[PDB]
Amino acid sequence: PFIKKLAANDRKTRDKALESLQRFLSQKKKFERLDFLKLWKGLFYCMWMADKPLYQQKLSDNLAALVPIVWIDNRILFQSTFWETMGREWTGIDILRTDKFYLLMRRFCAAAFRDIQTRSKTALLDKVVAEYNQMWMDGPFNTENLAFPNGILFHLADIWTEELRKVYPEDVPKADWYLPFDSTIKSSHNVVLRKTLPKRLDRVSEYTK
Amino acid sequence: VNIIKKRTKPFKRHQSDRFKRVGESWRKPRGIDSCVRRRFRGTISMPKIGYGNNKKTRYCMPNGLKAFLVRNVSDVELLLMHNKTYAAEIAGNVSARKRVEIVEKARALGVKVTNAGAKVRSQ
Amino acid sequence: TVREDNGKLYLYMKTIERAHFPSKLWQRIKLSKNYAKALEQIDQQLLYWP
Amino acid sequence: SIFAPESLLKKTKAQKQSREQIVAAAAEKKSARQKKREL
Amino acid sequence: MKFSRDVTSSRRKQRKAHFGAPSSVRRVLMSAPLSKELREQYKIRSLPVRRDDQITVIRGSNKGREGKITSVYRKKFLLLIERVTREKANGASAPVGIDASKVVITKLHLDKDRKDLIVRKGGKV
Amino acid sequence: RSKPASENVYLKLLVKLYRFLARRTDSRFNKAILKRLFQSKTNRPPISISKIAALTSRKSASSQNKTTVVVGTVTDDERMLTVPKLSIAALRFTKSARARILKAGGEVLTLDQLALRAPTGSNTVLVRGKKHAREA
Amino acid sequence: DSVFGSTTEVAQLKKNYFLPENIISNADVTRLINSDEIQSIVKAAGPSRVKR
RNA sequence: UUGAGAAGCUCAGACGAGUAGGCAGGCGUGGAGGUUUGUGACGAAGCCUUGGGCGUGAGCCUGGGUCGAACAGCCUCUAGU
RNA sequence: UUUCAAUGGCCCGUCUAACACGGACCAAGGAGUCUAGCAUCUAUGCGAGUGUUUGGGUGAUGAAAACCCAUCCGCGAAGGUGGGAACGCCCUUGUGGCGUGCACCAUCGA
């Protein structure tokens, strides 16, 4: 009843429906994955239809800060559905539009690192990264789903440590920040995705173990 | 680049000077009895690919600008970015009024109109 | 593109995200008389274009 | 603040490898081609 | 367009039935538009042309010359008006054929037949 | 052969992709994928869903994660009752083959989606079909 | 949607009609070549039109 | 450095008669659909020319005279070409 | 362009060295076209299938077009061993080794 307005052809209607989703999403209940897969087919097109470079790079942040609005239980469900729906239809783009769906990925990967910082003050981060790592093990970095394209993970390696440093300027503590990228290059059957992934990664071994 | 021609005399079909039924446009002879086909010396020459002209100074008038048929007032507009490599040749059936308005605008675009003077006596 | 309209030169730009709206497809910027100002106004509008 | 088209971010990284890996074989060529000019 | 299979659109069939129509068809093909002062009092767009009407010529080189029709020449498809006469070399005068579609009727030669056509065809007296 | 005999302008596109991939990489896969798109329709014969399932899954049944790749048409065999979990990548799929792979199995790809999954063509099988009509 | 249907669903106003599909999955071939899937693996490029 | 009609652009070498024959690209004529916000009584088509221009060529564009109602370029289809 | 000078230049086509045969000239006409059958190659659509047009239904805007289609019917209807396309893992970088080996060809099975 709500999504088919997010794919309107008027930015005065698309955005007018976006801020009311902030009311719709902060509800304290349980959401099923497909319901977040149908909602994430609206915010794809809410961002697929984005005209100006000073609006789409503001729309991305309004999508990025939408994650802390999600309830604590389904906050990790909401990002898992995005990385699926940003890997299911990444081949449908062209170069004149990938440039704007890279920054949405850059924000959401960074918006994850921000939420671990928020969750690290409630409970120890060693479990918070693991269940976040779990979300990485059934989303992009899952091995058995060969359909997840390379262009996501090549860009997911370049923005991994740099927006870890951006959200943690003082010092990021030791955790399994790179464990997704180690289990990926070890057994994933995309041959180039295990060969040239280390050549793209900027992993920092001084603080990790 | 200075324009050059490998030949200036066109080719003229054999014995198209004697007979008035035979036209002057070139036609390669088809008989092996022919003196011309076997290319006996003294007979006329033939069109071959040897006389092909330079692939850059082709289609160029002796000035250096290639031609372009402008048959209305929005056909000279395309020549705005090409005024130093094209000459706006006006088409023949264009009226002697629609002609006098192409000239007054091609002159603003600095384009050479080759035959702007037709039907146009100035005062 | 750049194309004049009644004395003053304009700059017309299009994008993918307005392609399906042929009325609103092309936007417009009016280029200043100062020739060095107009070059510095094309670049600031056409940034990171090829 | 327009940022950048981050496609052009990853051309400026692959052109730090293209420059370095051939500007290295510029001194190592010019120092090499002083041996053979004598030899 | 036309949507009848019992009308003809070929130039051949239409341009033959015109030039070889009999002299009763050749009457209603020679009709004249009424003047703007008669178009509102008879409510008739056009009348077929009678003899002794009161017309004015709108088109042609004989522009605006008023008169009355002398001999409605149904054969060569033209009216013949009073005193609009091209000269001849010999000294006599010749009549100028004005097309029946060019004249504008200013006063009808009202008769019992025309009135019984006027009163039914959209108007009155 | 240097240009396809066809006028399918969705197949000038593939040739525009694999004759780029032939010269910017060191794989002879792309210099074999391109070397087949030029071949005429009688030179790219069909290959069934059973011969594909027999080629990969035999001897040791090495069918771990390799994408079978035929530049032809993946037709059907209905004498095959159960279909294994396969993954193919061809130009054309017949509508009874594409519904007999997905019903219990994997992925159906065009050579577009192949070039974004194995850009140098590793972990693949490059099969053909039988050219033999036995008299024609 | 009932005259032509879909690519995997029968058009309702036509017996045994399914909409065709494509030999290229993405309808745009000069925007795979420039993707991150290709330009990571390719060998070092040569120059443009070469010097004489 | 922009030279991406990737059916484009660019670099370098060798070669050049040609019969029967084989292959390829184009030129022109009458009609048909689409297109040129197409040309035309301020002169369309045609015709003539000791005028100019292009193409290797088939051909095309044009100035002057004549003349008086229609006509052409581009992409396809078609043949009593 | 007209002409002059110098140098060259056996009349064209059909024939079989010359010939012969055709040629007074000019204009317009004028000759591998249509159809059925078979085969090759290529293109496209679908594919163990494929083919609407004998018909029927429909078609208000050339309604002989386009569009839809029942019942027949026509054409068709899983052996090892060597190479060998390609692709992994190699470590003698490669070389070579190592594994899976498509079409096609030999070899022994039926």
Side-chain angles (χ1 to χ4, degrees):
Chain A
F2 188 91
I3 290 55
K4 46 160 69 161
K5 291 179 303 272
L6 269 157
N9 322 128
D10 302 331
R11 190 255 183 172
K12 279 77 191 155
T13 315
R14 273 176 284 160
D15 199 70
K16 250 58 171 178
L18 195 143
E19 72 265 349
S20 74
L21 185 142
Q22 313 214 320
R23 188 68 52 194
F24 164 68
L25 203 173
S26 88
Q27 306 164 355
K28 304 316 196 82
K29 60 215 297 175
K30 306 304 295 304
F31 285 97
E32 192 295 310
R33 158 159 309 256
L34 193 72
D35 310 324
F36 274 168
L37 286 179
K38 287 158 107 62
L39 182 141
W40 261 119
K41 197 34 77 179
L43 308 170
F44 188 99
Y45 282 104
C46 185
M47 182 45 188
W48 185 89
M49 301 175 258
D51 312 0
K52 282 288 201 182
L54 217 59
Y55 161 58
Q56 63 199 1
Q57 79 182 17
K58 164 198 166 189
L59 180 48
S60 70
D61 295 64
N62 216 307
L63 280 183
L66 175 45
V67 165
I69 304 174
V70 197
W71 199 22
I72 316 84
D73 50 349
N74 48 11
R75 197 170 313 186
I76 198 58
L77 182 69
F78 186 81
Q79 303 164 190
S80 56
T81 41
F82 171 61
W83 288 112
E84 191 275 6
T85 197
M86 212 36 193
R88 182 253 320 262
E89 258 186 313
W90 168 268
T91 314
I93 318 294
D94 57 345
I95 58 193
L96 311 166
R97 177 177 268 147
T98 50
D99 328 311
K100 82 205 198 205
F101 277 121
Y102 273 124
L103 203 150
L104 186 66
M105 280 176 11
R106 180 175 289 169
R107 287 304 173 251
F108 268 71
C109 179
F113 288 156
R114 205 171 263 109
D115 189 65
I116 317 144
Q117 173 174 40
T118 72
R119 258 166 174 151
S120 196
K121 305 317 286 170
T122 44
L124 216 164
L125 55 90
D126 53 354
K127 69 99 176 179
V128 191
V129 60
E131 270 55 39
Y132 253 57
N133 198 347
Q134 177 26 274
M135 182 304 298
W136 297 118
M137 300 314 78
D138 57 354
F141 306 104
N142 163 4
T143 64
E144 71 156 19
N145 47 0
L146 273 72
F148 211 103
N150 306 24
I152 290 329
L153 301 195
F154 287 159
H155 195 262
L156 248 201
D158 297 330
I159 66 200
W160 192 271
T161 195
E162 225 64 6
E163 309 65 342
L164 205 48
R165 296 288 176 196
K166 190 173 297 198
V167 65
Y168 277 145
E170 180 274 313
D171 198 317
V172 63
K174 187 257 159 184
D176 294 332
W177 308 118
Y178 299 147
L179 176 55
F181 300 106
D182 312 308
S183 159
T184 294
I185 49 193
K186 186 61 67 180
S187 43
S188 199
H189 316 89
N190 215 305
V191 171
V192 70
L193 209 58
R194 74 173 70 186
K195 279 176 87 160
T196 72
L197 189 44
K199 286 156 196 62
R200 293 293 262 261
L201 193 49
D202 305 350
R203 81 188 316 268
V204 183
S205 161
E206 59 89 22
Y207 74 57
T208 39
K209 293 283 310 302
Chain B
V1 195
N2 303 338
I3 321 294
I4 35 173
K5 299 297 140 70
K6 288 207 187 151
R7 202 176 156 83
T8 304
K9 308 298 304 167
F11 301 86
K12 182 182 145 297
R13 183 205 199 291
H14 182 40
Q15 283 314 120
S16 72
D17 56 320
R18 186 180 289 176
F19 301 105
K20 287 146 171 90
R21 48 174 180 274
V22 181
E24 276 132 29
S25 64
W26 171 251
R27 313 257 169 227
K28 174 207 186 285
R30 296 302 193 174
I32 64 163
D33 194 297
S34 170
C35 292
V36 192
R37 193 228 270 279
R38 299 229 206 158
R39 220 187 315 165
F40 284 140
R41 204 211 61 240
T43 64
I44 44 159
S45 47
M46 283 156 195
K48 292 195 287 293
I49 198 65
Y51 309 84
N53 292 274
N54 199 340
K55 196 195 276 283
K56 314 165 170 198
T57 76
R58 255 176 80 184
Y59 304 121
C60 289
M61 310 215 168
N63 47 47
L65 319 96
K66 303 177 181 180
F68 192 76
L69 272 75
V70 317
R71 31 188 90 84
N72 58 336
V73 200
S74 61
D75 276 1
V76 75
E77 172 46 3
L78 319 97
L79 260 56
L80 155 54
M81 290 257 290
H82 289 269
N83 60 344
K84 278 180 196 66
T85 181
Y86 268 106
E89 191 65 324
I90 309 192
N93 52 350
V94 182
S95 91
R97 174 251 301 270
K98 174 154 299 166
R99 180 172 308 254
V100 318
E101 316 197 48
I102 281 155
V103 186
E104 81 166 60
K105 190 223 201 206
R107 194 171 40 221
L109 317 170
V111 186
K112 303 309 173 191
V113 176
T114 325
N115 50 359
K119 319 176 171 188
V120 85
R121 59 180 289 270
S122 279
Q123 102 179 16
Chain C
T1 185
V2 166
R3 45 189 312 267
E4 90 275 40
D5 155 24
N6 189 257
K8 54 189 83 70
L9 318 158
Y10 286 118
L11 169 81
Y12 289 82
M13 293 153 313
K14 66 186 281 187
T15 45
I16 299 287
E17 302 96 321
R18 298 195 307 284
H20 279 297
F21 296 92
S23 77
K24 294 153 181 48
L25 197 150
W26 301 87
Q27 271 146 36
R28 194 150 55 150
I29 290 296
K30 162 170 69 183
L31 268 66
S32 295
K33 285 275 163 60
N34 175 29
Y35 187 71
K37 174 69 197 273
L39 307 178
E40 290 300 315
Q41 193 169 355
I42 284 177
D43 272 337
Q44 155 213 72
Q45 206 57 237
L46 261 72
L47 46 86
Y48 303 151
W49 290 41
Chain D
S1 295
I2 219 76
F3 284 110
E6 45 262 12
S7 313
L8 193 134
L9 263 295
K10 322 187 302 310
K11 186 153 47 179
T12 57
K13 186 58 196 77
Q15 274 159 346
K16 198 177 69 73
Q17 300 325 106
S18 76
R19 194 151 300 91
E20 273 181 23
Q21 205 207 325
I22 72 169
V23 76
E28 305 212 350
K29 194 73 41 163
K30 190 185 134 180
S31 65
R33 296 290 87 83
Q34 286 322 108
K35 295 178 177 65
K36 281 189 176 290
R37 186 72 158 180
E38 299 164 338
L39 178 139
Chain E
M1 204 192 145
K2 58 97 172 182
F3 317 115
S4 278
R5 278 208 42 220
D6 265 349
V7 317
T8 178
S9 159
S10 58
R11 198 178 157 98
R12 203 190 170 160
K13 286 202 207 296
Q14 278 265 357
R15 202 187 134 84
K16 180 216 308 207
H18 180 274
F19 285 131
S23 305
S24 199
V25 181
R26 285 173 186 258
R27 172 183 74 90
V28 292
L29 316 162
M30 274 193 310
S31 306
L34 266 64
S35 158
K36 300 275 286 180
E37 301 76 330
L38 274 67
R39 184 171 287 182
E40 61 77 10
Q41 67 179 176
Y42 299 100
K43 278 81 67 178
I44 302 178
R45 170 60 63 103
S46 303
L47 265 305
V49 179
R50 210 215 180 274
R51 170 136 151 282
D52 292 334
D53 260 323
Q54 194 78 66
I55 59 135
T56 66
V57 194
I58 290 296
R59 292 283 163 265
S61 161
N62 284 304
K63 186 175 190 185
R65 311 201 56 186
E66 191 294 349
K68 308 185 292 308
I69 318 173
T70 78
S71 76
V72 192
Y73 186 30
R74 268 193 218 168
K75 175 282 201 173
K76 262 197 296 186
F77 266 108
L78 48 91
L79 310 183
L80 279 188
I81 323 161
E82 269 191 285
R83 306 164 264 132
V84 48
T85 36
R86 159 150 209 84
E87 59 159 4
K88 211 195 171 68
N90 199 51
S93 43
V96 202
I98 290 297
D99 177 34
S101 167
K102 308 288 100 177
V103 310
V104 158
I105 281 178
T106 88
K107 202 167 70 63
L108 310 159
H109 167 273
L110 281 183
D111 204 349
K112 55 97 175 179
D113 72 354
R114 247 172 172 165
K115 269 184 282 192
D116 273 298
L117 181 163
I118 299 206
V119 303
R120 48 161 166 97
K121 266 189 63 79
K124 60 184 297 299
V125 178
Chain F
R1 289 287 179 278
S2 316
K3 170 134 184 227
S6 52
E7 51 275 10
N8 189 355
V9 302
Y10 284 98
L11 189 79
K12 319 291 105 172
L13 263 60
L14 286 182
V15 181
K16 206 167 296 204
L17 159 64
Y18 271 114
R19 91 199 310 185
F20 168 81
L21 267 168
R23 78 166 146 82
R24 295 289 305 259
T25 42
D26 209 27
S27 274
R28 283 179 276 174
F29 189 57
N30 301 313
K31 317 178 142 67
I33 289 294
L34 179 69
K35 221 201 284 191
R36 286 162 183 279
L37 301 178
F38 301 140
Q39 293 193 327
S40 73
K41 186 184 170 299
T42 75
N43 259 318
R44 319 182 299 250
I47 172 172
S48 314
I49 205 180
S50 69
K51 194 178 290 159
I52 293 188
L55 274 169
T56 80
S57 314
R58 209 190 177 121
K59 294 231 92 54
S60 297
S62 54
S63 284
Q64 321 305 126
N65 280 121
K66 306 181 280 285
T67 49
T68 309
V69 181
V70 49
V71 280
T73 308
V74 178
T75 61
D76 190 40
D77 201 342
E78 61 295 9
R79 314 181 290 250
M80 182 152 272
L81 295 323
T82 78
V83 202
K85 201 264 180 177
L86 277 188
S87 161
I88 322 194
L91 328 175
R92 264 109 185 178
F93 286 81
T94 88
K95 306 188 299 298
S96 48
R98 204 191 323 261
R100 269 180 76 85
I101 291 153
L102 299 171
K103 204 42 181 283
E107 300 107 349
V108 281
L109 320 196
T110 76
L111 314 179
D112 198 315
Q113 283 164 349
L114 205 154
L116 307 193
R117 185 185 304 271
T120 183
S122 187
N123 263 61
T124 57
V125 193
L126 186 55
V127 312
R128 318 185 191 199
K130 307 264 289 165
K131 185 43 181 93
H132 213 307
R134 279 276 156 111
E135 191 162 347
Chain G
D1 284 342
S2 317
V3 176
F4 302 106
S6 97
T7 172
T8 48
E9 165 74 31
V10 47
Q12 174 45 210
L13 303 194
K14 279 152 186 51
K15 283 172 210 158
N16 310 322
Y17 198 52
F18 282 83
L19 201 69
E21 307 209 352
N22 227 339
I23 310 329
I24 219 175
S25 88
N26 187 29
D28 159 3
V29 83
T30 81
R31 279 75 170 196
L32 320 163
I33 289 167
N34 303 9
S35 57
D36 204 320
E37 281 94 317
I38 298 314
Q39 306 272 342
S40 314
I41 87 167
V42 290
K43 76 194 292 181
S48 60
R49 44 176 216 278
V50 200
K51 83 181 169 169
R52 313 185 51 237

